[PDB]
Symmetry: C4
Subunit: 355 residues, 4 copies
C-alpha cells in the first residue's frame, strides 16, 4: 500500500521467452495437425535456443567483475539450456525430442529472486514439516486402513485392497473430493466426519507453517535490503540506536523508471518518500529537481492536504516510501527532527515556486 | 467487538438497484416463458436506466464543492451507465442487448469504499504475487507434463495431450477435485501425494499474502481515518507523543443515526465511548445530553457494574468506542488523567440525576 | 499449553440432551421400520420434553438473585422448548410433527458461552464482510456470465441459462468441485485459471477476516475475565501500572474439580500456578494445604527440575497458570519481587516437609 | 532461514523401519499374487519384529540413568510392539493376522518429539474446539435438515431421509464436493450459497485455532529449550534482565555433525553463530579452532562482506545462530558490548591468519 514498484520487475528477456516457448509444444501433441505450423514453431525453439545461445557466450564472458562470485546457480541451467535440446535432437529421432522442454522451466527460476528466499527458510522449519509429514502418513494409514476392514466384501473392485483406499484417503483428507469411488454403508461414512476435520486442521497447521516464518523472512527482506540507503541520508547521523529497528519494518525501497509519474498533483496526500539516488521532475514554475538524498510529502502530511506538485520520475530513481503514522511516529519520536521538517514545511512553500 | 456501526452503511440507492436489476435478466434467458413478465421487467431496466439517468444530471452538476477533485473514478461508470444500454438497444436488435447488463456491475464498485482499499496494497506486494504466479506455472507444467508421459497410451481421449493434463493439474492442485478424468495406473497416482501437499502450501503462502498486509492496511484504516477526531477532544493537549500510537490501533470511529440505542440500561458494562459530534439521550431524570466532545462509561468500568443510563442516539452522532483494558491502559499510563476521570466518576453520580 | 481445564466444561444436562434427542428423529424417517423402536424413542422426546419442562418451572422461579438481569436470551428458548412440540402434537396429526426438532437446536446455544463471543465481533467488522460479500457477487456474476456466452449452443441442457452457470461459479469458486456439469471447449476452460486463483484469494481474505479480530476478542477474553483474581493476591499492591498489561495476555484462569490431579511428582517441571480460591493436596509428610491466594512451581522453575510434590485438587479450585518465560519475565522485571520468591524457594524447601 | 539443522534429525532406526515395514502389507492384500514375494516380506516383519525385539531387551535394561523417570509413554508401545503380532500369529490362523500392522504406527510416535508438543496445547484451547465442534453440528443439522423438506418427494433414493442429507452437508460444508448426489430444484440450490460461505468461515476460525496458539508453543519452543546455552557464554553476565526476552525469540539451537560444512568462504555473509559445545574447522593458515563457547560472523556483518573463512564442522557441535538485525539490535542495544566485538572485528583479522 506504500510503494511505487515500476521499471519492469519482470525485466530480463532470459525469463520472458520460456512462456511463449513452452506454448510451442502443444501443437505437436495433437493429431490431425497440418505440417505448416507444426514446424513453424519448431523454428521458434531454434530461436530461443539460438537466443539464449546468443546470450550464452556473453554470459560465459565471466571476466566481468571477476573477483569473488558464486555462479554455479546462475550458470547451471545455461549449460543444459542448449545441450539437452542438442542431444535430444539426434538420439531421439522421433518428434518426442521436444518433450525435453522440461529444461527451460528452470530459466525463470534462474534469475528468480524471491526463489532463494523460498528455499532459505525450508532449512530451518522442515523439522516441523517432517514431524507433520510423518504424522500425515500416520493419520493416513491409521485411517486409510479402516475402510479395508469393511467394503472389501461388496467393493472388491474399488476397496479390495489397501492402497486403493490410501488413494481415497488423501482425496478424502486433502480437501478434494474427486468422486470416483465412495462407500455405501453407514460406519465407513461415519468416519469421514473426522477426516475433513483432520486434514483441514492438519493443513490448518502444515500450510500455516509456510507463511508463518516465511512472512518473517519477507518482513525481514524489508530490512536486510534496507539497512542500506541509510547512511546516504545526510540527516541520519542523529537517529537513536533503537530508533531504526522501529522504522525499517515499514520502509520499502523500489525503483521508478525515467519518464514515469511519482505523485500527481491534486490527489489526496497520503505518503512521503525518501530519495537517495537519481533525479525527479517536481512540477513547479522553477522545478525543484532534488537529486540523490532527498524527500517530499511533509508539506501535505503535516497539513493533511492534496499534493503540492506533480512529481514525475525524471530519471531511474531508487526510491523509498513512507506513510504518515510512521512519520507521525518519527515526529512523535524526537522534537529534534520535527524542527527541520517544520522549517522544510516552510522552506519548500517558497522554494517550490522560487529556486 | 467494540463498535456501534449503524446508519445504513449500505446507504446509497445508486448501489442498491444493481441487485434487483441484474435479477431482471434471467427470465429472458429461459425458453417457454410468457411475454407478460418478460417485458414487465424490461421496463425495470428502463427504471434504473431512467433512475441513474435521473440521478445522472444531478451528478453532472459538478459545481458542488468544485475547487480540486478527482472524479474520473466516480464518473467513469455513470457515463457508460446509460450509453451502453442505449447503443445496445439499437445495434443489437435481438433481445441479447440485455446481455450488456455486465455494465451496472461497477456501480456497486462506484461508491465502494473498501475497494480502493483493495487495489491500494496490490501495488506493493504483487512483486511476490508474480514470483509466486510464475512459480505456480512452474509447478504447473513441471507436474502437468509428468502425466502425458504415461496415460497417452491408454487414455488418448483424456490424456492424449498436454493442456488436457494442465487442466487436471490445477483442478488437482487448486483444492478442487472435479472428477471427470483421473488416472488408472500406480505411478501417476503416486504423484498426487505431492500435489495437494504443494497447492495447499502454495496457497498456503499465496492467499496468505493477501490478508498479510491487507490487515496492515485495514489496521491502518483505523488510524488514518482517526488521527482525526483527536484535537476536537478538549482534554488531549497533554497526551504524550508516543501515547497516541499505542491507542489509536484499537479506537474505531463509526456513526449512529438519530433515534437509535447506544447503551441500554442494566446490560453488563463492557465499553466506553468518546463523543465528538452530535447529541445523545442519556436516560436520567434530568437528561444529561452531552454534545460534541464528550464520553461515558467510566462510571461502569472503574466499578465493573451494569449501565447507569439508557443512552440513546438523539441525533446522528459520529462516535468513537473503547473497552476497559485500553482505558485501563490509559489509567495505567498516566496518573494525571485518572484524577479527572475519578472526579468524573463522582461528578456524573450526582450530575446524572441533577443537572 | 499452560492451563488445566477440568470440571466438565460441557456441564449442564440442559445442553447434553439435545444430542441424544435429535438422534431420536431419524428412525422415524425410514420406511420398513418396525413400530417397536419407532415410538420407544417417541417417548424419549417426552422425556426431554418433560425433563426441560421439569427444569422449566424451576427456571421460571426467577426470584433467585432477582435484582437486575437480562434473561431474554436464556429464557427465549425455554418458552418455545415445550410449546412448539405441544402445538406440533395436534395440528400436525401426521408423524411430521417430529420435524419440529429444529427447536432444541438452540438449547445448546442457550447456555453456550463462547457464542455471544461470536456475535460480538460481527458487529464491528461486517463492514468488511458486506464489502467483500458484494464483491463476492461482483466476481460471481462477472465470471458466471462469461460461460453463458459460449456453451449455450452445445450445452443448452446444462448452460442454457445464467443461474445454471451461477451454480457452477460458486462451486468453481468456493473450492468445491462437485463435478456434474463442466465445459468442453478451450476458452471456457481458460477462465477457470483465475477462478480458484480468485476464490482462494477472496476467502484468502474473507475467512481471514473472522479469525483476525476474533483472536483479538479471544486474546481479550483472557483479560476481561482476568483483571479479576488480581487484587485477591496479597502481593500485587506493588505491581507497576504498565506491568499487568504485559502479563495478563498469557495468564488464563480455569477451575479444577475436587479429587483431581494438579501436578504429579517427578514429571518435568514446566509451569507454576497462582491459587486464589479453594484448597489443594500438596503431597508431603506434612501436607502444605494452601488455601485461597497462593502459588507453587518456583521451586522447580528457578532450579529447572522435576516436581517437588504431587499436588492434587483437594477441592474445586479456581486456578490460574503460568510458564517460566513469563515468570522469568517477572523475575527479570523487578528485583523487588524475586527477593520473596527466592525466600519462598527456601521456605518451601523446609516448610514442605515441616509445617 | 537462520539455522543449520543437520545430523539426521530423523535419526533412530526405531523410527525408520515402520515405513518399509508397513509397505510389506499390501502385496498380501492382492489376489493373483505368487507365493514367492508373498512370504519373502512376511519374513521382513519377523526382521523388524526381531529387530525391535533385539532392541527391546536393551530398552528393558532400564538401569541406565535410573533415578527419576516417566517412561510409560516410551515403553507403552515396545510392550505391544512384539506381543500383538505374536498373539496375532496364532489366534488369527488366516493371513489376516497381518492386519495388526496398525500397531507399529505408534513407533514413529514413540520417539516423536514435536508430538507431545501437539497434545500439549489441545488441553488449553479445546474449550474453543468443543464450542465450535458443537456449533459445527448446530450448523450441520440446522442446514442438513433443510433439504429433507424438499427432495424427499423426487429423491427418495438419495434424499429420502435425514442422515442421507447430513452426509451431503459436511461434504457440502467441508470444502469437498464429492459429487454423487446433488439437488435438482431451485430453492435447495439457493441454500448452498451460505454453506461454503459458512464452512470456509467456520474452518476460517476452527483450523485457525490450531496454528494460533500452536505457533505460540513453537515460538515458545525456541525459548524453553534455549534459556539453556545462556550461562555457558562467558560474556552474558552483563546482559540486562529485559534484554534476553527480546533476543531469544529469534535464536534457535541446532546441532551440526562432524565433517559437515558450516559457512563456506566467499558466500554472501548473512548470519553469525554462537558456539557453546564442540569444535570447528576455521579454514585459515593457522586454523583458529574455537571450542565450546565462541562465535563468528561479526567480521562480515559489521562490514557487510562475504565470508572470511570456510568454517566446517570438525566435530558434532551444538550450535546457535543469528542474523544481523537482531545483532544490530544488540549493537544498538548497548555500547558496552560493541566495544569487544569491535575489538574482535580487529583481533580476528590478524588472529585468523596468525595463532
Ligand atoms: K474440493
Ligand atoms: K467431485
Amino acid at each position: 500500500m506504500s510503494v511505487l514498484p515500476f521499471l519492469r520487475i519482470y525485466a530480463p528477456l532470459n525469463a520472458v521467452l520460456a512462456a511463449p516457448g513452452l506454448l510451442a509444444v502443444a501443437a505437436l501433441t495433437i493429431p490431425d495437425m497440418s505440417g505448416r505450423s507444426r514446424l513453424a514453431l519448431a523454428a521458434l525453439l531454434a530461436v530461443i535456443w539460438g537466443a539464449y545461445l546468443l546470450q550464452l557466450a556473453a554470459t560465459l564472458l565471466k571476466r566481468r567483475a571477476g573477483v569473488v562470485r558464486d555462479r554455479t546457480p546462475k550458470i547451471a541451467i545455461d549449460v543444459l539450456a542448449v545441450l539437452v535440446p542438442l542431444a535430444a535432437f539426434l538420439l531421439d529421432g522421433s518428434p518426442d525430442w521436444s518433450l525435453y522442454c522440461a529444461v527451460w522451466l528452470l530459466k525463470p527460476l534462474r534469475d528468480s529472486t524471491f526463489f532463494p528466499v523460498l528455499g532459505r527458510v525450508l532449512a530451518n522449519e522442515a523439522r516441523n514439516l517432517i514431524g507433520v509429514t510423518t504424522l500425515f502418513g500416520v493419520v493416513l494409514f491409521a485411517v486409510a486402513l479402516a475402510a479395508y476392514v469393511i467394503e472389501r466384501d461388496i467393493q472388491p473392485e474399488k476397496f479390495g485392497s489397501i492402497p486403493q483406499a490410501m488413494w481415497w484417503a488423501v482425496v478424502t483428507l486433502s480437501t478434494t473430493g474427486y468422486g470416483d469411488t465412495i462407500p455405501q454403508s453407514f460406519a465407513g461414512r461415519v468416519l469421514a466426519g473426522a477426516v475433513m476435520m483432520s486434514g483441514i486442521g492438519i493443513f490448518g497447521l502444515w500450510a500455516g507453517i509456510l507463511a508463518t516464518g516465511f512472512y518473517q523472512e519477507v518482513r525481514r527482506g524489508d530490512f536486510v535490503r534496507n539497512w542500506q540507503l541509510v547512511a546516504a541520508v545526510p540527516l541520519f547521523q542523529k537517529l537513536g540506536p533503537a530508533v531504526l529497528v522501529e522504522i525499517v519494518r515499514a520502509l520499502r525501497a523500489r525503483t521508478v523508471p525515467a519518464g514515469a509519474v511519482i505523485c500527481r498533483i491534486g490527489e489526496p496526500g497520503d505518503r512521503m518518500f525518501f530519495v537517495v539516488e537519481g533525479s525527479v521532475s517536481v512540477a513547479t514554475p522553477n522545478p525543484v529537481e532534488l537529486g540523490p538524498g532527498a524527500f517530499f510529502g511533509e508539506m501535505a502530511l503535516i497539513s493533511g492536504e492534496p499534493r503540492s506538485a506533480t512529481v514525475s520520475a525524471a530519471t531511474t530513481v531508487s526510491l523509498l516510501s513512507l506513510h504518515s503514522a510512521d512519520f507521525q511516529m518519527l515526529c512523535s519520536s524526537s522534537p529534534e527532527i520535527a524542527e527541520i521538517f517544520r522549517k522544510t514545511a516552510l522552506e519548500r512553500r517558497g522554494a517550490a515556486a522560487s529556486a
